[PDB]
Design a protein around this motif. Structure first.
Motif, PDB file in Angstrom:
ATOM      1  N   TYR H   9     -74.775 -14.447  40.238  1.00 11.85           N
ATOM      2  CA  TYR H   9     -74.407 -13.048  40.433  1.00 11.85           C
ATOM      3  C   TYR H   9     -73.181 -12.585  39.622  1.00 11.85           C
ATOM      4  O   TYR H   9     -73.194 -11.484  39.063  1.00 11.85           O
ATOM      5  CB  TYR H   9     -74.209 -12.753  41.925  1.00 11.85           C
ATOM      6  CG  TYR H   9     -73.170 -13.615  42.612  1.00 11.85           C
ATOM      7  CD1 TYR H   9     -73.448 -14.942  42.953  1.00 11.85           C
ATOM      8  CD2 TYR H   9     -71.913 -13.099  42.936  1.00 11.85           C
ATOM      9  CE1 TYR H   9     -72.498 -15.733  43.601  1.00 11.85           C
ATOM     10  CE2 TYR H   9     -70.957 -13.880  43.582  1.00 11.85           C
ATOM     11  CZ  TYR H   9     -71.254 -15.195  43.912  1.00 11.85           C
ATOM     12  OH  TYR H   9     -70.311 -15.969  44.553  1.00 11.85           O
ATOM     13  N   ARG H  10     -72.143 -13.424  39.548  1.00  6.87           N
ATOM     14  CA  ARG H  10     -70.906 -13.114  38.805  1.00  6.87           C
ATOM     15  C   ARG H  10     -71.130 -13.093  37.277  1.00  6.87           C
ATOM     16  O   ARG H  10     -70.885 -12.074  36.618  1.00  6.87           O
ATOM     17  CB  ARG H  10     -69.810 -14.121  39.173  1.00  6.87           C
ATOM     18  CG  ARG H  10     -68.418 -13.779  38.648  1.00  6.87           C
ATOM     19  CD  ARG H  10     -67.785 -12.595  39.373  1.00  6.87           C
ATOM     20  NE  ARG H  10     -66.422 -12.348  38.903  1.00  6.87           N
ATOM     21  CZ  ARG H  10     -65.330 -12.930  39.400  1.00  6.87           C
ATOM     22  NH1 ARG H  10     -65.424 -13.802  40.400  1.00  6.87           N
ATOM     23  NH2 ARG H  10     -64.139 -12.659  38.876  1.00  6.87           N
ATOM     24  N   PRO H  30     -67.048 -12.835  30.094  1.00 10.55           N
ATOM     25  CA  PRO H  30     -67.756 -12.332  31.278  1.00 10.55           C
ATOM     26  C   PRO H  30     -68.898 -11.365  30.949  1.00 10.55           C
ATOM     27  O   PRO H  30     -68.872 -10.654  29.935  1.00 10.55           O
ATOM     28  CB  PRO H  30     -66.645 -11.653  32.082  1.00 10.55           C
ATOM     29  CG  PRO H  30     -65.650 -11.232  31.020  1.00 10.55           C
ATOM     30  CD  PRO H  30     -65.632 -12.410  30.089  1.00 10.55           C
ATOM     31  N   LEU H  31     -69.926 -11.391  31.793  1.00  8.35           N
ATOM     32  CA  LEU H  31     -71.075 -10.511  31.632  1.00  8.35           C
ATOM     33  C   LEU H  31     -70.993  -9.406  32.684  1.00  8.35           C
ATOM     34  O   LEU H  31     -70.501  -9.624  33.796  1.00  8.35           O
ATOM     35  CB  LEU H  31     -72.379 -11.294  31.823  1.00  8.35           C
ATOM     36  CG  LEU H  31     -72.665 -12.437  30.848  1.00  8.35           C
ATOM     37  CD1 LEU H  31     -73.994 -13.048  31.196  1.00  8.35           C
ATOM     38  CD2 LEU H  31     -72.678 -11.917  29.415  1.00  8.35           C
ATOM     39  N   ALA H  32     -71.449  -8.215  32.315  1.00  7.51           N
ATOM     40  CA  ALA H  32     -71.459  -7.076  33.224  1.00  7.51           C
ATOM     41  C   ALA H  32     -72.844  -6.446  33.138  1.00  7.51           C
ATOM     42  O   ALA H  32     -73.529  -6.567  32.114  1.00  7.51           O
ATOM     43  CB  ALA H  32     -70.401  -6.071  32.820  1.00  7.51           C
ATOM     44  N   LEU H  36     -73.882  -0.378  33.609  1.00  7.08           N
ATOM     45  CA  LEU H  36     -72.493   0.058  33.766  1.00  7.08           C
ATOM     46  C   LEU H  36     -71.834   0.614  32.497  1.00  7.08           C
ATOM     47  O   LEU H  36     -70.750   1.195  32.562  1.00  7.08           O
ATOM     48  CB  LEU H  36     -71.651  -1.087  34.328  1.00  7.08           C
ATOM     49  CG  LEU H  36     -71.570  -1.300  35.845  1.00  7.08           C
ATOM     50  CD1 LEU H  36     -72.702  -0.601  36.589  1.00  7.08           C
ATOM     51  CD2 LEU H  36     -71.557  -2.799  36.130  1.00  7.08           C
ATOM     52  N   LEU H  37     -72.464   0.384  31.343  1.00  7.76           N
ATOM     53  CA  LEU H  37     -71.960   0.881  30.057  1.00  7.76           C
ATOM     54  C   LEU H  37     -73.034   1.736  29.400  1.00  7.76           C
ATOM     55  O   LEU H  37     -74.219   1.399  29.455  1.00  7.76           O
ATOM     56  CB  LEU H  37     -71.604  -0.267  29.110  1.00  7.76           C
ATOM     57  CG  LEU H  37     -70.315  -1.057  29.309  1.00  7.76           C
ATOM     58  CD1 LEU H  37     -70.514  -2.126  30.385  1.00  7.76           C
ATOM     59  CD2 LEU H  37     -69.938  -1.710  27.979  1.00  7.76           C
ATOM     60  N   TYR H  46     -70.051  -5.531  21.867  1.00  7.59           N
ATOM     61  CA  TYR H  46     -70.511  -5.850  23.220  1.00  7.59           C
ATOM     62  C   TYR H  46     -72.024  -6.042  23.214  1.00  7.59           C
ATOM     63  O   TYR H  46     -72.774  -5.151  23.616  1.00  7.59           O
ATOM     64  CB  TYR H  46     -70.140  -4.732  24.201  1.00  7.59           C
ATOM     65  CG  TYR H  46     -68.659  -4.448  24.273  1.00  7.59           C
ATOM     66  CD1 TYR H  46     -67.802  -5.245  25.038  1.00  7.59           C
ATOM     67  CD2 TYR H  46     -68.114  -3.387  23.560  1.00  7.59           C
ATOM     68  CE1 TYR H  46     -66.433  -4.986  25.087  1.00  7.59           C
ATOM     69  CE2 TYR H  46     -66.760  -3.119  23.598  1.00  7.59           C
ATOM     70  CZ  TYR H  46     -65.921  -3.917  24.359  1.00  7.59           C
ATOM     71  OH  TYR H  46     -64.576  -3.626  24.357  1.00  7.59           O
ATOM     72  N   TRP H  56     -77.685  -7.453  30.509  1.00  8.49           N
ATOM     73  CA  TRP H  56     -76.254  -7.644  30.696  1.00  8.49           C
ATOM     74  C   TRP H  56     -75.500  -7.392  29.401  1.00  8.49           C
ATOM     75  O   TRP H  56     -76.029  -7.622  28.312  1.00  8.49           O
ATOM     76  CB  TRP H  56     -75.983  -9.072  31.147  1.00  8.49           C
ATOM     77  CG  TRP H  56     -76.681  -9.431  32.415  1.00  8.49           C
ATOM     78  CD1 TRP H  56     -77.966  -9.887  32.553  1.00  8.49           C
ATOM     79  CD2 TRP H  56     -76.122  -9.399  33.730  1.00  8.49           C
ATOM     80  NE1 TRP H  56     -78.237 -10.149  33.878  1.00  8.49           N
ATOM     81  CE2 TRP H  56     -77.120  -9.856  34.623  1.00  8.49           C
ATOM     82  CE3 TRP H  56     -74.868  -9.031  34.245  1.00  8.49           C
ATOM     83  CZ2 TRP H  56     -76.905  -9.957  36.004  1.00  8.49           C
ATOM     84  CZ3 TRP H  56     -74.650  -9.129  35.619  1.00  8.49           C
ATOM     85  CH2 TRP H  56     -75.666  -9.591  36.482  1.00  8.49           C
ATOM     86  N   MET H  59     -68.829  -8.704  27.841  1.00  6.69           N
ATOM     87  CA  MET H  59     -67.529  -8.041  27.790  1.00  6.69           C
ATOM     88  C   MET H  59     -66.568  -8.865  26.942  1.00  6.69           C
ATOM     89  O   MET H  59     -65.607  -9.451  27.439  1.00  6.69           O
ATOM     90  CB  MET H  59     -66.986  -7.819  29.205  1.00  6.69           C
ATOM     91  CG  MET H  59     -67.934  -7.049  30.130  1.00  6.69           C
ATOM     92  SD  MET H  59     -68.640  -5.529  29.420  1.00  6.69           S
ATOM     93  CE  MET H  59     -67.171  -4.694  28.769  1.00  6.69           C
ATOM     94  N   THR H  61     -64.103  -8.228  24.958  1.00  6.15           N
ATOM     95  CA  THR H  61     -62.669  -7.976  25.041  1.00  6.15           C
ATOM     96  C   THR H  61     -61.996  -8.467  26.324  1.00  6.15           C
ATOM     97  O   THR H  61     -60.781  -8.376  26.455  1.00  6.15           O
ATOM     98  CB  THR H  61     -62.347  -6.494  24.799  1.00  6.15           C
ATOM     99  OG1 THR H  61     -63.163  -5.681  25.648  1.00  6.15           O
ATOM    100  CG2 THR H  61     -62.599  -6.130  23.342  1.00  6.15           C
ATOM    101  N   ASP H  62     -62.786  -8.993  27.256  1.00  7.62           N
ATOM    102  CA  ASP H  62     -62.262  -9.525  28.521  1.00  7.62           C
ATOM    103  C   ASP H  62     -62.356 -11.053  28.521  1.00  7.62           C
ATOM    104  O   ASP H  62     -62.346 -11.690  29.579  1.00  7.62           O
ATOM    105  CB  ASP H  62     -63.056  -8.997  29.733  1.00  7.62           C
ATOM    106  CG  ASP H  62     -62.851  -7.510  30.003  1.00  7.62           C
ATOM    107  OD1 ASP H  62     -62.587  -6.731  29.062  1.00  7.62           O
ATOM    108  OD2 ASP H  62     -62.987  -7.115  31.180  1.00  7.62           O
TER     109      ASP H  62
END
Ligand SMILES: [Cl-]
Ligand SMILES: [Cl-]
Ligand SMILES: [Cl-]
Ligand SMILES: [Cl-]
Ligand SMILES: [Cl-]
Lengths: 101, 96, 101, 96, 96, 101, 101, 96
Positions: H9-10, H30-32, H36-37, H46, H56, H59, H61-62
């Motif tokens: 999930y994360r 990390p994946l988002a 969301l974008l 990205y 997904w 991210m 830059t994170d």
């Protein structure tokens, strides 16, 4: 000690806070405290009954009663002031928050 | 080093053996101002020590493993209190 | 309770821990615990004197003695196992960390 | 709501007045498994309550302000224990 | 207080209405050194303000609710920039 | 996405929140969100103008407008509901908090 | 700005860090940085070119390349030095960590 | 293990070389959720990847250094996207 104001030895959270726990109750690893905030940060509308205004030096501070918390004694800093003379107001603030009285 | 008090102005006493060298963590017991605890609190479990002219209580029950990278300067030596510190720790784990 | 293994009710790198504090010593808000880690995460070159290997179910776990910590009783979960039969090894690990020899 | 037990570090009793809306937080007292504390621990300061068939101790001295956004589902109601809860809190602040 | 800059040497601007008391928190926008962002970054969304001789960028998208107990001393007043701040916030929420 | 309600991946602070940032504004690493709290936790005396009451399923939730925060997109979970029909109330709540006179 | 060394505004960590993100790439809320540590002989298996040694004043510092992290621009302090002359070493360190075949 | 995807999930992608392994830390991105974008966000920097139906965004830059002890189960393998991932990372550091 009850009604004494101390500094916080940690990063964030608070700068100043008042010890409001009884002097006969040893946790002993923590003490119940109420954080202080600059009075200028709250308007006059905010109830002085729940959030008493106290003076530490020449500055005015609001007691953030609803942000009361248990804090470990190892992080309690130096004693800055004594608010024993305000015992009645502090007592009323705490009793109001719990018992609506 | 064992029985030495360090900062990271928070204080703590290193209570780990000097023979345990490889671990990247030292077992420490935090110190709290003695005025914050009443005299009714056991001196067996929470010894009272002096650093300078002030009194401090050893918060034995708040013992924790701390990374060596966050251990600051050596402030004092409590080797002379070895017996009290040893008793406090033994009481917490095996104690009678 | 001493020598009992419990689950953790907080966010942690560890899911299991062993209570090593005496049953006659009530803090009472905390308990001294030693976290457990999967044995596969540490090589055999790591001292078994200081880091005992215990079994719970079909899995092997290492006692991370040097990561011992004081944990609030409110975050201690359900009892998963009893390691009373390993009392001697646990005692030796703890005594070695503090008094060496 | 006062005297109600909610979930999320799992169980908490809301002890703040219902007439006082912060409104972003609530004063709560965490619960711990009663088996974790011996009977020698004061029931005046740490009341023992029952949620289902299990016994829990109210960790009065660990009282804290918690944001309402993290308060979970209502698990039980301890209104019948109002007197004990009130005494515990009054003892911690005003005890002689 | 709205449009006042406070210390945390971390800086942030209080952007919450003075008529709205949470009262435990305040909506703030953190400031960052202007040299850290190129001129190609929108001045509409990230206004550039001056405090002393230094230039700072308002990190509008990093806006956050902060407890009043952690707000330090008042460093400056940006009331004269009310229009730019208002536009930045309105743009982030409503696409202007 | 604006007006959508999501879950929070971490165990701390929030459980459910509403994305209130414009869809044309990509941070892009974060999103402005307003946390939701169970409506039963706040009395009816608390302003519905500042803290709107919304429905998700059969439960009532209060929008904790004053606890608005910037949250990294990597921690935003699954979409639980859409509150586009409440756009006017949400807009008023936000405008009141910043520009209320 | 790339290759500039700054002081930190947050807690813990090191003390100094080098901005290694491109100047043409604005996040714009964060910057990729590599923390500096007081120079010491490493025992870290392979590569001493993975941890370049740089000078700031009369002191020697090691670039802890493997501890690289994204840091918010609001916590980046004052510019302490410029390591543009070491561009080649820094580039090699980073390329080695990601693609180092 | 480089180019793979793990949890806690994360979701995050290990982007560190398999040759470098001595530190108990791995460089991860990390994946988002792609929803969301907006599509206006650069796919060069990205990248958009797929894992079990869903889309997904990486991210980039994170990016952060994460201890190996917190890395969970392997969820997927993005080796086939090596070129896009490499370009994203090179762009962030060397400007394309
Ligand atoms: Cl002494
Ligand atoms: Cl704690
Ligand atoms: Cl009962
Ligand atoms: Cl200006
Ligand atoms: Cl509705």
């Amino acid at each position: 000690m009850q009604f004494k104001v101390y500094t916080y030895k940690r990063e964030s959270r608070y700068r100043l806070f008042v010890d409001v726990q009884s002097d006969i109750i040893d946790t002993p690893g923590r003490r119940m405290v109420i954080p202080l905030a600059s009075a200028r940060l709250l308007s006059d509308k905010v109830s002085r009954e729940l959030y008493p205004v106290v003076h530490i030096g020449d500055e005015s501070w609001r007691m953030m009663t609803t942000d009361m918390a248990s804090v470990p004694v190892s992080v309690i800093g130096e004693e800055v002031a004594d608010l024993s003379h305000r015992e009645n107001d502090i007592k009323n603030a705490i009793n109001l928050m719990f018992w609506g009285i």
